[PDB]
Amino acid sequence: MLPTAEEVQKLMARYIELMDVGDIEAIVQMYADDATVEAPFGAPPIHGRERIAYFYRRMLGEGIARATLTGPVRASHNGTGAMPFRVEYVFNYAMDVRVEMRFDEHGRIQTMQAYWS
């Protein structure tokens, strides 16, 4: 069965925590088997869990400082939710990210679109 509104926030609230600490391996396992990431939305989709790992290694790999919610987690009963948030980095940077997410019956991320500022 599809994860409830409750379970979605529990899973999506966890996303921002794994981002803030920059846990790549953990986030990659949140995603379903042949999941799609569209980040930013308008660029070619990233199919497969393998290539998603690289996207997150692009974003986090360098070393993130913070990743914090800039609005409420809008969870639906269709196993989908969106949340506007922000990421900040340490270099010798910041960006407003607004992810929408779709969960399968197994509680994993099927599709993400992310809109960057």
Numbering used by the authors: 0 to 91, 95 to 119
The authors write:
As proof‐of‐concept, we designed protein binders to target three distinct epitopes on two different oncogenic targets; vascular endothelial growth factor (VEGF) and interleukin‐7 receptor‐α (IL‐7Rα). Using the described strategy, we sought to design proteins able to prevent activation of the VEGF receptor (VEGFR) by quenching the receptor‐binding site of VEGF. We named the designs utilizing the first scaffold Sam and those using the second one Sima. We selected eight of the best‐scoring Sam designs (Sam0.1 – Sam0.8) for experimental validation.
The final sequences have 19 to 24 mutations compared to the starting template. To evaluate the accuracy of the computational design, we sought to determine the experimental structures of the designed binders. We obtained crystal structures for the unbound Sam0.2 and Sam0.7 proteins. Alignment of the experimental structures to the corresponding design models showed that there is an atomic‐level agreement with overall backbone Cα root mean square deviation (RMSD) of 1.8 Å for Sam0.2 and 1.7 Å for Sam0.7. Further analysis of the per‐residue deviations revealed that regions with the highest mismatch (Cα RMSD per residue > 3 Å) correspond to the outer rim of the Sam binding site (e.g., R56–M58, A64, F95, A96, D119–V121 for Sam0.7). We ascribe this to the open and closed conformations of Sam in its bound and unbound states, respectively. While the designed coordinates of Sam were derived from its complex with VEGF (MD‐relaxed structure, Experimental section), the crystal structures represent isolated Sam monomers.
